[PDB]
């Protein structure tokens with residue numbers, strides 16, 4: 001356990017919250033600083049595969065999360081132009097038996113609130129309205145500066161300040177890399193959506209330079225919709241690229257089922273999609289970058305928040321194993337071991353994710369090949385998914 | 396049979412020769428005019444699938460053709476960059492039982508000479524050094540003009556003057572469509588080629604914007620090599636595009652096994668690859684376009700000469716069936732029925748051929764998809780090949 005340890009967490013997104021919970025459950029003294037004046041997340045969906053579900057179950061929060069979630073029966077890929085089913089990933093008992101938990105979907109806001117509530121219940125001292133301005137290592141302590149003029153001492157610090165991380169600048173001068181794709185979201189009352197057939201699955205329509213995803217939320221009561229498309233504005237050097245004037249044309253070549261979808265999306269805000277080139281070293285002295293600060297992906301594998309959750313489980317588990325006997329002196333080794341375990345995993349998701357999205361967005365003959373590949377696969381094989389859903393940090 | 400019939404054939408390539416043989420075997424009076432001063436073809440390879448072999452066997456020329464041919468055991472597709480085997484098409488007893496004959500390869504020159512010799516033996520009057528300048532229909536005869544000032548009367552005429560057909564202008568004003576790919580050939584003494592492992596198959600290396608094909612000829616004594624690549628010069632408007640200064644760079648990204656291949660090719664002559672948009676009507680009065688004059692393909696399905704051979708079998712068979720009772724008055728109906736049977740077949744080869752070549756030349760993620768598609772196919776299924784190799788005109 002981590003009783004005498006002190007950890008400061010910079011950032012209170014899903015990653016920071018998950019880390020607060022994991023560490024506080026091990027008995028650590030956790031202090032978390034979040035810049036925003038309230039904890040919160042977007043009231044739209046995310047997908048959590050069993051690689052995340054199993055961890056939430058270990059922390060004792062999965063039953064509760066599931067009480068407000070949706071359990072899809074399959075992931076269904078469809079051609080965005082013909083609406084033809086290409087393949088399905090079955091999420092039933094064989095799947096859940098293999099991977100140790102369910103694939104579920106839920107509101108980001110709910111998942112976040114649940115983690116925050118559990119972290120507080122486990123003893124984590126959470127602070128909103130507080131920006132971490134600097135982290136340095138002096139001797140065997142991390143010294144953390146905040147925007148009220150104060151400094152704070154801890155054994156380690158977690159840089160969990162997201163894609164646009166300023167703490168990352170301590171380790172890397174790299175900048176976010178534009179995908180040239182923009183994402184729009186929407187949630188609609190289920191019944192309020194015009195559907196030919198009912199939706200009980202995650203449905204992804206994949207087409208030339210675009211995709212469109214639908215899944216239910218909150219026990220079937222709401223439908224989440226997500227449109228991602230290649231922005232003409234980006235390649236022309238627009239700074240505020242991917243705006244909603246681009247949507248109609250981006251989907252004009254698609255099936256009516258996809259086109260009808262566009263009307264339900266929120267249009268007042270959107271998410272231009274950036275990632276970063278993978279980096280091997282996430283550690284500066286007694287600071288480690290985790291979550292999006294370390295490994296921000298494009299969302300095709302729907303695993304960014306899951307990675308941050310996995311980061312929390314690995315850090316907590318590895319620290320509790322080593323700190324118990326080695327104490328505070330052991331932290332730099334612990335952070336090195338966590339980085340060594342996490343970097344190859346996460347970096348593969350970053351790189352493979354890029355290719356996966358590319359595979360979704362193919363056109364012409366390449367699309368014809370892609371479609372046939374999907375249709376004719378061995379659906380009993382797990383070779384495409386075991387590396388993702390079957391991973392564990394347990395040693 | 397066709398005893399009282401007179402047919403004039405404009406053009407003496409593989410198609411004209413095959414038509415001369417088929418018609419003369421039915422007892423027709425055949426006169427063929429070839430522009431060149433000698434009959435001849437390029438002394439390089441072609442591939443003849445069982446859709447052609449079965450027809451040659453019917454004409455009694457297959458045993459003889461095979462005595463100078465090579466019988467490959469498989470068609471092997473390899474990645475041009477890694478040299479990895481992707482898939483094989485087995486050409487063994489199951490294949491030959493399904494499709495009614497062998498897939499073989501041979502010299503174009505030999506195949507052509509064999510057809511010409513058989514046509515002469517069957518009674519066809521062949522003329523070299525004679526250009527057909529015009530064909531018109533007057534009453535119930537085709538009137539054929541030649542470049543010595545003479546005119547000739549026949550019941551029908553075949554326009555078999557190839558890709559650059561001037562007789563086609565009677566029916567269509569279309570022009571050849573550039574693929575932007577150029578083809579080089581070579582034949583080398585087998586032993587004279589530097590091979591890591593021996594070649595007993597048709598081997599096709601498929602890569603980004605290029606491919607490279609190898610197969611033995613003449614019982615294993617020679618190796619045929621064919622390089623096809625996308626020409627940078629074509630897109631820049633060079634008139635004489637695809638020249639050999641482009642070869643080294645076109646293959647620079649490929650495996651050594653492919654790169655070594657380039658050195659064996661003839662460099663003093665090359666074949667820029669053009670086809671034509673498919674057309675439905677090939678008939679003008681008592682003239683029918685056949686062979687490349689009607690349906691010139693890009694050579695990815697290796698079926699252009701085979702199509703011309705199929706044209707000969709269908710024309711001869713359908714005419715012999717109908718002329719016997721209807722006589723000369725029946726020819727326009729016969730030509731219509733041949734066109735009706737042949738156009739959908741041949742036009743599918745033209746169009747599918749284009750996509751097939753595109754599938755060979757993919758790059759990036761599309762290549763990754765294509766490779767996996769090929770590797771994971773049901774190799775017992777014939778769904779990709781039955782439409783091609785299992786076709787027959789027999790009614």
Ligand SMILES: Cc1cc2nc3c(=O)[nH]c(=O)nc-3n(C[C@H](O)[C@H](O)[C@H](O)COP(=O)(O)OP(=O)(O)OC[C@H]3O[C@@H](n4cnc5c(N)ncnc54)[C@H](O)[C@@H]3O)c2cc1C
Nearest residue numbers: 011013014015035047132161162291292302303304305306
């Ligand atoms: C369109 C889209 C769809 C997605 N869908 C999925 C999905 O289905 N499943 C999945 O697993 N992932 C998904 N992701 C990825 C996921 O949203 C992220 O990987 C994840 O939320 C990152 O969490 P984080 O806590 O590391 O960073 P963030 O969410 O960015 O949180 C960082 C926090 O730190 C705060 N902050 C910044 N600087 C400071 C500072 N200096 N001091 C204090 N606080 C600071 C911020 O206010 C913020 O709250 C998706 C992403 C996108 C863009």
Ligand SMILES: Cc1cc2nc3c(=O)[nH]c(=O)nc-3n(C[C@H](O)[C@H](O)[C@H](O)COP(=O)(O)OP(=O)(O)OC[C@H]3O[C@@H](n4cnc5c(N)ncnc54)[C@H](O)[C@@H]3O)c2cc1C
Nearest residue numbers: 406408409410430442527556557686687697698699700701
């Ligand atoms: C690089 C390449 C590889 C190929 N590989 C294969 C393969 O493996 N298998 C396959 O089946 N096919 C293959 N083909 C296709 C094949 O070569 C052709 O489809 C086929 O030869 C066409 O035969 P044809 O008799 O219709 O026309 P052509 O071969 O063009 O013959 C037309 C003839 O008419 C003559 N002529 C022109 N005008 C007149 C006139 N006005 N009067 C008299 N004579 C005239 C010409 O001199 C010529 O001899 C390939 C083609 C290329 C370019």
Ligand SMILES: [Cl-]
Nearest residue numbers: 299302303304
């Ligand atoms: Cl993601």
Ligand SMILES: [Cl-]
Nearest residue numbers: 301302303304
């Ligand atoms: Cl992801």
Ligand SMILES: [Cl-]
Nearest residue numbers: 694697698699
């Ligand atoms: Cl051809």
Ligand SMILES: [Cl-]
Nearest residue numbers: 696697698699
């Ligand atoms: Cl062809």
